C-alpha cells in the first residue's frame, strides 16, 4: 500500500517498529549515516531525524515495552535512546562502555540486558537497567572462533527467551548457541558455508532460522520433548530458495497465520510456512507489483514516458526512437509523473517540490521548457491527474485537494 | 563540446575553494534536507558491500 | 550617516594609512620572521608533541578496516 | 487571563498578562512580542518574596529544584480561587507536583517561549525591584544554596 | 564501589595485566601509590593502573586529580592481589605507572592498551 | 662524577624554568579558518578579506585584525625576541641532554641491584620475593 | 594540595633548604624535616627515629 | 610595556620586550592560577595553551559575541582559568554565569567566584536548565566547553531556554570526545549539520591548530 | 483593569470620556489607563489639555506616547501649564 521513497544517495540498513499499547505505530529507520530517522506513518515524511551523538549507526534494536532503543555506532559505542511521550520525541539516555570494535548487531533480552555482536569476533553483553549499580557496564565478552586468513566478524545475534540462550551468526558460517548466564557456549554448528547475515526464531523458540550469503536458509529445531529436556539444538532441515543472496529475514506467528519472509540481493521476497518449513509450499513474490505505477503512456504522438529515480525518459512508436531523456537535480525522490492529453504539459511530482514542463516536438528529439508554477512548487503532491488539457488537479500530503492552472472534501471518522 | 559541459557542471555543483588563505563552504537550503535526512556514508557502506563481495567467496 | 567623502575620504584614507603603517611597524621584521618561526616550530614540536596522538588515531583508524587484506603474518 | 508561576527573585511570582492560554502561547511568538508590546502586555499578580534570608533561599531552592510543595508556593497557589484554571509551569516535575490540588497544570514547548518573554522583561514591571538588586540577589542565592545544598 | 570510576572489563583487564607482566619483565614500570605519584609529578608515566579493592579507595584516588591535570590515561582493576601477582611482588600493590621508553620492545602493545584506556574517558 | 640524585634535581629545576618560560612566550596561530555563507552570490563572487571590514594588507596576520572604525626601539625588539627564543631552545636542548644523562646513569645504577640477568638486557622472570 | 603529594615529600616537607643544598652539593639528604616534632619520632631512639 | 587594543572591547595585546595576549583586572593585585601580571593599571595575561577561548582569539574570530556590557553564560566551566578572563572582559556592570557539573572543581569555582563578584557559579549539571532555572535570565551569549558528546543537544536546550534572540553561540568542540577514528573536518561538518538542524545559524568555524590539537571553535548567531 | 484591556482591544479593532477615564484613574491600573488614553489619542483638544494637567501630577511608554499625542495636538499656555507642573 504505502511507499516512502528517499532519493539519490541514501540507504537503509536497519529499521524497527514501535507499537506501545494504545498509540501510533512508528518506524525508526537508519540511513547510511548518523541519524535515527523516525518516519511518520501519516504521509511519508520523516517527522523526526535524531542525529545520534556518537559514530555512524550500524544497527537498531528496539527494547521490549518499546520505551528504549539501542543503536550501535562505528567508533565502538552503543547508544541508548529513550522514546516516551508519543511520537516526535527522542532523547539520548546514555552511551554504554566504549570499546574498539565497529558494533554490528544488537538485541535486547528484556528491559535489562543488551547483547551486541561486534566486529572483532566477540559478542559482548552490556547491562543497562535502572536502579542497579552496574548500568552502562558490560559483563562478558564471549569470543567466537576466528580464522587466520580473514577477520571474522559476527554479523548478527538474537536472544532466545525460553531456553535462555543467545544465537550468534558470524562470517565463518559458525552458528553458535551460547548460554546466557555463565556466559559461554552451549553448542556450535559449522553448518553454513559463507557469511551468515541474519537469523530469527518464533514466539516460544522451538526453531532458529538462519540465512546467509550463499542463500542456503536452514532451520535448527528443538521440537522433541527430550531435546528440550536437554535444551539442545539439532541441525534439522535445510532449504535453498534463492538466486544470489539473503540479506534479511523475519518471522511471524498467530493462530491463523505463521510464516517466514526473507530477502536478498536479488530483489524479490520469498515466503515460507513457518512451522512446516520442510513441508510448506513456499511462494516467490514478483520483483515489481507496481501498485504505485512508474510508466505512463499517451495516445497523442503515440508516446511513452518512463520515469526512473529522479530521471524521466520519453520515446514514441511507429520501429521506434528513444527520443529524449531528462535528469533533474533539484528533484531527488521521484513520484507520479503524468503527461497531458496532448504532447505539451508534463507534471513531475516530488512531495517537496513538483514541476511542470511543456514539450515542443521538433522531430527526432523533443524540446523541454520549464514553466514556473509556484503554488505547485510549494505544495506537496501525491497524485497529479490532468482533468483538462491545461488545468490539473493535485492531491495533498495534508489531505487537501487543489486545482492548478480550492476543492473541498468531506471528513471521515477515526 | 567534449568536457566543458561536465566541467561547468562540476564548477557549479561543488562547494567553494580556498580564496586567499582560508576556505569557505556553502550552506544549503534547509528546505532540501528536511524530507530525506542523511546522506549515506559511502566510505563505510562501500566497506560492507566490499566484504559481501569478498574475493574469498566467489 | 552622511559619508560626505570629499574631504572626509582623503582624511580617512590618510589616517587609516598612517595608523595601519604604525600598527604594522609595531611588528618585528618580515625578513627576520623566518628564524623566529622556525624556533617557534621546533619549540612547539618538542613541547606539544601531538605526533603521538596523530599516530594513535592512525592506529585506531587502521584497526577497523575489516581486513579483506590478508592477515597472513 | 494568565497563570504562570515564575520563580525568579527569592520565591514564586505569578504572571497576570493580557492574553489567553497555551493557544495564545502558540500565537505568542507568532505575534513576536519581544518588545514594549510584551512590556505592556505582561503585568504582576503576586510575588511571595519572604526574605533574602538563607532559610527562605533554601526553601525556595528545594521548591524550584525538587517537588514544589513549599509553603510559600502553596500560599501563592491558594490565592486564585475563582476558576481553578489551567496554569503554565516550567519543569515537568514541578508541574506534576502542582497538579495535585484543584487546578490544571500544563507545561509544553511554548511555555518556554512565554518564559523567555518574561525573563527578558521581568524586573522592569512585575516585582518593582531594580535590575542590579536582582543581579546581586541571584548571586547571593547562587553562592548560598546553589552551593551548600548540592556541594557539601 | 561507586567512586571507582572507570574500571575495566574482563578482557581488557586481562590484556592490561599481561602488558603489565611484560612491563615487569622488561623493568619499565614503577609500582606503588607514592612511587606512582612521584613519577606522575616528574612526568614520565605512560598510563596508570589502580586497584579498586582497598578498604579506603581514597588511599589511591588522589592521583586521579593530578592525573586529570596532566591528561595521563588512568584505569582501575578490581583486584590488588592480581596487581601484585602481575607486577611481580609478593605483596598486594595498589597502583602502577608505566614509564616512557620509545626504544622498548613492547611499545606497540603499550600504545594499543593506552588507546583502549583513553577511549573510555 | 655527580649522581642520579643530583642530575634529577637539576633537570627538574630546568624543566620548571622551561615550562614557565613558555608560559610567557607567544606562538603564531595557524592551520585554517572557514566562513559559512548562504549558497549563491557568495560562490559567484568569493568572499574576500573585506568580509572582516578591515584593511587589505592587515589580514594575513592571525592575531589582532583591527577594523576600520577601530583603526581610524627599532632593532632592540627583534634582537631581544630572537635571543629569548634562542634561550628557550637552549633550555630545551639542556633538558634533552640532562634527560639522556639521567637515563644512562639510572640504567647503570639499576644494572647492579640484583636479578638473574644476561646480556642479550633482560631479566629472568622470577618475582622479587 | 597536601594530599596530592607522596610519602617522601610528606617526610621531608620541613627541612627543604638543607635538602636542596645537600642535593646540589654532594652530601646526604635529611630524613625528618617537619615530622621530627611529632610525638613518635621522639619516642624512638637512635636511627630508629629515621625509620 | 605598551598596551594595544584588540578587535573585541575588553582584550588587549601587550607589546614591548615580548608580544602576548592580555586582559584587564576585576580583582586587582592577585593572579588566580599562577599567570603573569603586567601593570602599566594592572592586567593579567592568559595563554592560549591551557585555555580554548584564548587560542580561538589568537586564531582570530570575526564577530565575537563576548561583550563588555552584556551577559555571558559559560557552560563547561573549568576550574577557574577561563571564566576569570571572561569575567574580566565582561566587566563590572555585566555578569558571567559559570555552570559546572562535576563538583571536585566546584570548590575552585566557589572560592574564585567569592573573590570576583562578576561571576556567579552554578553547580548543577549542564543538562538540566529546568534545575538551574530560577537564577538566570536572558543571557546575551553562551560559550560552551563541554566534553560530553551531546554538545549540540546541550547548547541547544540551554540556549533556547536561556539565550535571547540574536544571541551569540560560541562552542569549543573536540573531535575525540564525540567521534574518534574519523578525521577532524568530517566531524566538524557533522557537528555543524547538527547545529544548523538545531537552527543556530553558524557564522564561522576554525580549528585552532598549533596551540592545541584537534579541536574547533564554532561561532554563530541564534535565530529564533 | 479588564475594562482597560477592553478599551485597548476596542481601539485596536477600530484601527484594524477621557476626563472620566483620568478622573477614575487618579481616583498598575493608573499606568494601564494612561497607556489606554495614549492609544486612544493615537489611533480631542480641551479634554487632552485636562488630561495633560491631570497626568503631569502622576509609565515610560505612557509618557512617551503622551508626548507623541501632545506633539500631534494658547499653545504657549498649554506648554506653560505642562512645564510648570513638571518643574
Q: Do residues E51 and E79 touch, judged by C-beta distance below 8 A?
A: yes
Chain H nearest-CA distance from B31, in A, is 11
The cell numbers describing A358, all together, are 511543456
The cell numbers describing A78, all together, are 552503543
**Chains F and I touch, using 3 or more CB pairs below 8 Å:** no
Measured between CA atoms, the residue of chain H closest to residue D30 is H224
Chain E CB contacts of G13 below 8 Å? none
3-state secondary structure of E102: coil
Which of I4, I5, I9, I63 to mutate to probe the D interface, most D CBs <10 Å? I5
Q: Do residues D108 and D88 touch, judged by C-beta distance below 8 A?
A: no
Asked if F48 reaches chain B (Cβ–Cβ under 8 Å), the answer is: yes
Q: Do residues H44 and H85 touch, judged by C-beta distance below 8 A?
A: yes
Interface of B with C in 1-58 (CB under 8 A): 47, 50-51, 54-56
**Which residue from B47, B55, B56 is facing C66, i.e. has the nearest CB?**
B47
Q: What is the residue-wise DSSP string for D74-135?
A: HHHHTT-TTT--EEE-SSHHHHHHHTTSSSEEE--SSHHHHHHHHHHSHHHHSS---HHHHH
The cell numbers describing G15, all together, are 627541612
Q: How many CB pairs under 8 A join B and H?
A: 3
Chain H nearest-CA distance from A56, in A, is 9
Residue D14: CB atoms within 10 Å: 20
Q: Do residues A153 and A121 touch, judged by C-beta distance below 8 A?
A: yes
**Distance of alpha carbon E76 from alpha carbon A2, whole angstroms:** 53
Indicate yes or no: CB of H104 within 8 angstroms of CB of E65.
yes
Measured between CA atoms, the residue of chain B closest to residue F56 is B20
Indicate yes or no: CB of F35 within 8 angstroms of CB of H208.
no
I73 to each of F7, H221, I33, how far by Cα in Å? 92, 44, 20
3-state secondary structure of A285: coil
Helix axes of D111-120 and H151-162: crossing angle, nearest 10 degrees: 60
What does the angle CA I23 – CA I24 – CA I27 come to, to the nearest 5 degrees? 85
Q: What is the CA radius of gyration of chain D?
A: 15
3-state secondary structure of D60: helix
Chain B CB contacts of F36 below 8 Å? 24-27
Interface of B with H in 1-58 (CB under 8 A): 27, 30
Q: What is the residue-wise DSSP string for E86-100?
A: HHTBSS---EEEEE-
Measured between CA atoms, the residue of chain E closest to residue H50 is E69
Asked if H194 reaches chain A (Cβ–Cβ under 8 Å), the answer is: yes
3-state secondary structure of A287: coil
3-state secondary structure of D136: helix
If we measure between CA atoms, which residue out of D111, D92, I76 comes closest to residue H161? D111
Q: What CATH number corresponds to the domain at position E104? A: 3.30.1330.30
Chain D nearest-CA distance from I31, in A, is 9
If we measure between CA atoms, which residue out of A52, E111, F101 comes closest to residue C57? E111
Indicate yes or no: CB of E37 within 8 angstroms of CB of G4.
yes
Please give the sequence-ordered ranges of beta strands (E in DSSP) within A266-339, or none if there are none. 270-273, 283-284, 295-298, 303-308, 311-317, 320-327, 337-339
Interface of B with A in 12-51 (CB under 8 A): 13, 31-32, 34-42, 44-45, 48, 51
Residue A221: CB atoms within 10 Å: 17
φ, ψ of residue A407 in degrees (nearest 5): -80, 145
Q: Which residues contact A23 (CB under 8 A, 6 or more apart)?
A: A86, A87
**Which residue from F22, F66, F78 is facing C28, i.e. has the nearest CB?**
F78
Asked if E119 reaches chain H (Cβ–Cβ under 8 Å), the answer is: yes
B15-28 core/surface letters (b: 16 or more CB in 10 A; e: else): ebeeeeebbbbeee
Do β-strands H163-174 and H139-144 pair in parallel, antiparallel, or remain unpaired?
A: parallel
List the domain range (segments joined by +) for residue E53. 1-121
DSSP, res A236:
E
Indicate yes or no: CB of H180 within 8 angstroms of CB of E65.
no
Measured between CA atoms, the residue of chain C closest to residue B48 is C66
Q: Do residues B15 and B25 touch, judged by C-beta distance below 8 A?
A: yes
The cell numbers describing A375, all together, are 503554488
Indicate yes or no: CB of F3 within 8 angstroms of CB of G20.
no
Indicate yes or no: CB of B51 within 8 angstroms of CB of C68.
yes
The cell numbers describing C3, all together, are 559619508
If we measure between CA atoms, which residue out of H187, B31, H173 comes closest to residue A51? H187
Grid-cell match 542565592, residue found: D141
Asked if G36 reaches chain F (Cβ–Cβ under 8 Å), the answer is: no
List the resolution, Å.
4.0
Chain E nearest-CA distance from G9, in A, is 9
Number of domains in chain E: 1
Chain F CB contacts of E90 below 8 Å? 127-129
φ, ψ of residue H94 in degrees (nearest 5): -95, -165
Deposited experimental method:
cryo-EM
Torsion sign, CA atoms C54, C55, C56, C57: positive
Label residue I12 left, alpha or beta by phi (over 0 means left) and psi (-120 to 50 means alpha): alpha
Which of E67, E68, E116 to mutate to probe the H interface, most H CBs <10 Å? E68
Q: Do residues B15 and B26 touch, judged by C-beta distance below 8 A?
A: yes
Q: What is the CA radius of gyration of chain G?
A: 12
Measured between CA atoms, the residue of chain C closest to residue E110 is C56
φ, ψ of residue A306 in degrees (nearest 5): -135, 105
**Distance of alpha carbon A79 from alpha carbon H19, whole angstroms:** 47
Chain C CB contacts of H210 below 8 Å? 44, 48
Residue B13: CB atoms within 10 Å: 8
Chain B CB contacts of H196 below 8 Å? 27, 30
* Residues in A lying within 8 Å of B, measured between beta carbons: 6-7, 9-11, 13, 31-35, 37, 45-46, 49, 56, 74, 149-150, 171, 194-195, 197, 213-214, 245, 265, 329, 332-333, 351-352
Long-range contacts of B14-19 (CB under 8 A, 24+ apart): B15/F43, B16/F42, B16/F43, B16/F46, B19/F46, B19/F47, B19/F48
Chain F CB contacts of C47 below 8 Å? 22, 92
Indicate yes or no: CB of C70 within 8 angstroms of CB of A100.
no
CA D25 to chain centre: 16
Chain B CB contacts of A34 below 8 Å? 38, 41
Q: Do residues E48 and E73 touch, judged by C-beta distance below 8 A?
A: yes
Asked if G1 reaches chain E (Cβ–Cβ under 8 Å), the answer is: no
Which of G2, G3, G6, G13 to mutate to probe the E interface, most E CBs <10 Å? G6
Q: How many CB pairs under 8 A join D and I?
A: 10
H-run or E-run covering H147: none
Chain B CB contacts of C66 below 8 Å? 47, 50-51
CA A93 to chain centre: 25
Asked if C37 reaches chain F (Cβ–Cβ under 8 Å), the answer is: yes
Amino acid at each position: 500500500e504505502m511507499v516512502i521513497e528517499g532519493g539519490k544517495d541514501r540507504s537503509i540498513e536497519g529499521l524497527c517498529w514501535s507499537n506501545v499499547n494504545g498509540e501510533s505505530l512508528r518506524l525508526f529507520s537508519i540511513g547510511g549515516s548518523t541519524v535515527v530517522t523516525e518516519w511518520d506513518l501519516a504521509t511519508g515524511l520523516p517527522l523526526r531525524n535524531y542525529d545520534c551523538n556518537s559514530g555512524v549507526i550500524w544497527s537498531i534494536s528496539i527494547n521490549d515495552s518499546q520505551d528504549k532503543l539501542s543503536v550501535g555506532c562505528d567508533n565502538g559505542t552503543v547508544v541508548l535512546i529513550d522514546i516516551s511521550g508519543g511520537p516526535g520525541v527522542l532523547e539520548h539516555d546514555t552511551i554504554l562502555m566504549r570499546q574498539e570494535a565497529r558494533v554490528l548487531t544488537l538485541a535486547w533480552k528484556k528491559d535489562d540486558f543488551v547483547i551486541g555482536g561486534c566486529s572483532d569476533g566477540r559478542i559482548r553483553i552490556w547491562s543497562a537497567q535502572k536502579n542497579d549499580e552496574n548500568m552502562g557496564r558490560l559483563l562478558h565478552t564471549m569470543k567466537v572462533d576466528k580464522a587466520k586468513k580473514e577477520s571474522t566478524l559476527v554479523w548478527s545475534v538474537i536472544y532466545l527467551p525460553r531456553t535462555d540462550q543467545i544465537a550468534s551468526g558470524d562470517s565463518t558460517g559458525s552458528i553458535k548457541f551460547w548460554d546466557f548466564q555463565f556466559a559461554t557456549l552451549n553448542q556450535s554448528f559449522k553448518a553454513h558455508d559463507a557469511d551468515v547475515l541474519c537469523l530469527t526464531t518464533d514466539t516460544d523458540n522451538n526453531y532458529v532460522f538462519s540465512a546467509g550469503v550463499d542463500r542456503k536458509i536452514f532451520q535448527f529445531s528443538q521440537n522433541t520433548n527430550k531435546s528440550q529436556k536437554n535444551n539442545r539444538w539439532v541441525n534439522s532441515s535445510n532449504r535453498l530458495l534463492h538466486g544470489n543472496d539473503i540479506r534479511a529475514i523475519c518471522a511471524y506467528q498467530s493462530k491463523g497465520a505463521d510464516f517466514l519472509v526473507s530477502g536478498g540481493v536479488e530483489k524479490t521476497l520469498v515466503i515460507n510456512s513457518l512451522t512446516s518449513f520442510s513441508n510448506g509450499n513456499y511462494r516467490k513474490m514478483p520483483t515489481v507489483e507496481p501498485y504505485s505505477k512508474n510508466v505512463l503512456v499517451n495516445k497523442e504522438q503515440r508516446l511513452v514516458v518512463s520515469w526512473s529515480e529522479s530521471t524521466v525518459k520519453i520515446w514514441t512508436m511507429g520501429n521506434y526512437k528513444l527520443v529524449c531523456k531528462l535528469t533533474l537535480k533539484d528533484d531527488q525522490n521521484i513520484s507520479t509523473c503524468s503527461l497531458s492529453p496532448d504532447g505539451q504539459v508534463l507534471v513531475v511530482g516530488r512531495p517537496s517540490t513538483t514541476k511542470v514542463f511543456h514539450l515542443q516536438p521538433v522531430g527526432n528529439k523533443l524540446k523541454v521548457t520549464k514553466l514556473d508554477n509556484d503554488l505547485l512548487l510549494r505544495t506537496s503532491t501525491k497524485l497529479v491527474k490532468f482533468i483538462d488539457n491545461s488545468k490539473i488537479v493535485i492531491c495533498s500530503c495534508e489531505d487537501d485537494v487543489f486545482i492548478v492552472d480550492e476543492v473541498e472534501l468531506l471528513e471521515v471518522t477515526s | 563540446i567534449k568536457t566543458k559541459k561536465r566541467k561547468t557542471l562540476k564548477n557549479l555543483r561543488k562547494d567553494s575553494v580556498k580564496r586567499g588563505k582560508f576556505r569557505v563552504q556553502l550552506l544549503s537550503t534547509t528546505q532540501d534536507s528536511k524530507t530525506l535526512p542523511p546522506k549515506k556514508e559511502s566510505s563505510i557502506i562501500r566497506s560492507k558491500d566490499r566484504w559481501l563481495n569478498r574475493k574469498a567467496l566467489n | 550617516e552622511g559619508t560626505l567623502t570629499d574631504h572626509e575620504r582623503k582624511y580617512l584614507n590618510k589616517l587609516i594609512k598612517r595608523n595601519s603603517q604604525n600598527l604594522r611597524s609595531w611588528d618585528l621584521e618580515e625578513e627576520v620572521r623566518d628564524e623566529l618561526e622556525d624556533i617557534q616550530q621546533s619549540i612547539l614540536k618538542d613541547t606539544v608533541s601531538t605526533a603521538n596522538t596523530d599516530r594513535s588515531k592512525r592506529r585506531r583508524f587502521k584497526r577497523k578496516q575489516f581486513k579483506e587484506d590478508i592477515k597472513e603474518s | 487571563y494568565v497563570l504562570t508561576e515564575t520563580s525568579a527573585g527569592y520565591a514564586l511570582l505569578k504572571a497576570s498578562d493580557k492574553k489567553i492560554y497555551k493557544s495564545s502561547s502558540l500565537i505568542q511568538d507568532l505575534d513576536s512580542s519581544d518588545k514594549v508590546l510584551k512590556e505592556f502586555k505582561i503585568a504582576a499578580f503576586s510575588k511571595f518574596n519572604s526574605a533574602a534570608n538563607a532559610l527562605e533561599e533554601a526553601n525556595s531552592i528545594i521548591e524550584g529544584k525538587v517537588s514544589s510543595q513549599l509553603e510559600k508556593l502553596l500560599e501563592e497557589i491558594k490565592k486564585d480561587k475563582k476558576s481553578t484554571l489551567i496554569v503554565s509551569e516550567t519543569k515537568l516535575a514541578n508541574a506534576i507536583n502542582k497538579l495535585g490540588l484543584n487546578f490544571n497544570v500544563v507545561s509544553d514547548a511554548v511555555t518556554l517561549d512565554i518564559y523567555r518573554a518574561i525573563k527578558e522583561y521581568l524586573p522592569e514591571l512585575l516585582p518593582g525591584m531594580s535590575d542590579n538588586d536582582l543581579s546581586k540577589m541571584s548571586l547571593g542565592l547562587a553562592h548560598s544554596i546553589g552551593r551548600h545544598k548540592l556541594k557539601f | 564501589n561507586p567512586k571507582a570510576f572507570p574500571l575495566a572489563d574482563a578482557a581488557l583487564t586481562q590484556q592490561i595485566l599481561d602488558v603489565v607482566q611484560q612491563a615487569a619483565n622488561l623493568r619499565q614500570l614503577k609500582k606503588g601509590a607514592n612511587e606512582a605519584t612521584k613519577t606522575l609529578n616528574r612526568g614520565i608515566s605512560e598510563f596508570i593502573i589502580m586497584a579498586a579493592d582497598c578498604e579506603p579507595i581514597e588511599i589511591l584516588l588522589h592521583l586521579p586529580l593530578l592525573c586529570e591535570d596532566k591528561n595521563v590515561p588512568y584505569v582501575f582493576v578490581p583486584s590488588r592481589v592480581a596487581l601484585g601477582r602481575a607486577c611481580g611482588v609478593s605483596r598486594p600493590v595498589i597502583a602502577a605507572s608505566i614509564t616512557t621508553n620509545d626504544a622498548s620492545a613492547i611499545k606497540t602493545q603499550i600504545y594499543a592498551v593506552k588507546d583502549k584506556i583513553e577511549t573510555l574517558l | 662524577t655527580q649522581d642520579s640524585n643530583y642530575v634529577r634535581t637539576l633537570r627538574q629545576i630546568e624543566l620548571k624554568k622551561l615550562e614557565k618560560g613558555a608560559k610567557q612566550l607567544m606562538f603564531k596561530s595557524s592551520g585554517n579558518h572557514t566562513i559559512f555563507v548562504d549558497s549563491r552570490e557568495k560562490m559567484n563572487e568569493f568572499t574576500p578579506e573585506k568580509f572582516f571590514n578591515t584593511t587589505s594588507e592587515m589580514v594575513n596576520r592571525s592575531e589582532n585584525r583591527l577594523t576600520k572604525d577601530q583603526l581610524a626601539p627599532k632593532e632592540s625588539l627583534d634582537k631581544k625576541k630572537l635571543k629569548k627564543f634562542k634561550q628557550v631552545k637552549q633550555h630545551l636542548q639542556r633538558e634533552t641532554q640532562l634527560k639522556q644523562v639521567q637515563q644512562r646513569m639510572d640504567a647503570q645504577r639499576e644494572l647492579l641491584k640484583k636479578g638473574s640477568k644476561k646480556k642479550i638486557f633482560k631479566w629472568k622472570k622470577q618475582r622479587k620475593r | 594540595s597536601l594530599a596530592k603529594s607522596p610519602a617522601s615529600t610528606i617526610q621531608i616537607l620541613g627541612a627543604e633548604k638543607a635538602l636542596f643544598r645537600a642535593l646540589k652539593t654532594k652530601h646526604d639528604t635529611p630524613k625528618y624535616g617537619l615530622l621530627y616534632h611529632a610525638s613518635l619520632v621522639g619516642q624512638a631512639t637512635g636511627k630508629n627515629k629515621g625509620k | 610595556v605598551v598596551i594595544e587594543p584588540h578587535r573585541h572591547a575588553g582584550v588587549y595585546i601587550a607589546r614591548g620586550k615580548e608580544d602576548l595576549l592580555v586582559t584587564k583586572n576585576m580583582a586587582p593585585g592577585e593572579s588566580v592560577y599562577g599567570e603573569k601580571r603586567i601593570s602599566v593599571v594592572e592586567y593579567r595575561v592568559w595563554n592560549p595553551f591551557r585555555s580554548k577561548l584564548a587560542a580561538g582569539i589568537m586564531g582570530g574570530l570575526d564577530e565575537l559575541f563576548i561583550a563588555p556590557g552584556k551577559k555571558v553564560l559559560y557552560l563547561g566551566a573549568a576550574s577557574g582559568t577561563s571564566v576569570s578572563h571572561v569575567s574580566d572582559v565582561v566587566g563590572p556592570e555585566g555578569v558571567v554565569y559559570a555552570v559546572e557539573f562535576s563538583h571536585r572543581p566546584g570548590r575552585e569555582l566557589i572560592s574564585m567566584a567569592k573573590k570576583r563578584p562578576n561571576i556567579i557559579p552554578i553547580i548543577e549539571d549542564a543538562r538540566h536548565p529546568q534545575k538551574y532555572r530560577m537564577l538566570i535570565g536572558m543571557v546575551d551569549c553562551v560559550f560552551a566547553d563541554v566534553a560530553q558528546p551531546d554538545q549540540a543537544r546541550i547548547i541547544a536546550l540551554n540556549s533556547h531556554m536561556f539565550l535571547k534572540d540574536q544571541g551569540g553561540v560560541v562552542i569549543s568542540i573536540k573531535a575525540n570526545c564525540i567521534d574518534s577514528t574519523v578525521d577532524a573536518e568530517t566531524v566538524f561538518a557533522r557537528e555543524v549539520q547538527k547545529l544548523r538542524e538545531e537552527r543556530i545559524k553558524p557564522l564561522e568555524q576554525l580549528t585552532l591548530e598549533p596551540y592545541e590539537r584537534d579541536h574547533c571553535i564554532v561561532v554563530g548567531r541564534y535565530m529564533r | 483593569g479588564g475594562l482597560p484591556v477592553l478599551y485597548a482591544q476596542e481601539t485596536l479593532i477600530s484601527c484594524t470620556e477621557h476626563g472620566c477615564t483620568e478622573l477614575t484613574n487618579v481616583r498598575a491600573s493608573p499606568q494601564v489607563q494612561n497607556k489606554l488614553l495614549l492609544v486612544i489619542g493615537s489611533l480631542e483638544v480641551i479634554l487632552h489639555s485636562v488630561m495633560p494637567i491631570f497626568t503631569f501630577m502622576g509609565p515610560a511608554l505612557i509618557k512617551n506616547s503622551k508626548g507623541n499625542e501632545k506633539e500631534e495636538m494658547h499653545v504657549p499656555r498649554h506648554r506653560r501649564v505642562k512645564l510648570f507642573s513638571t518643574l
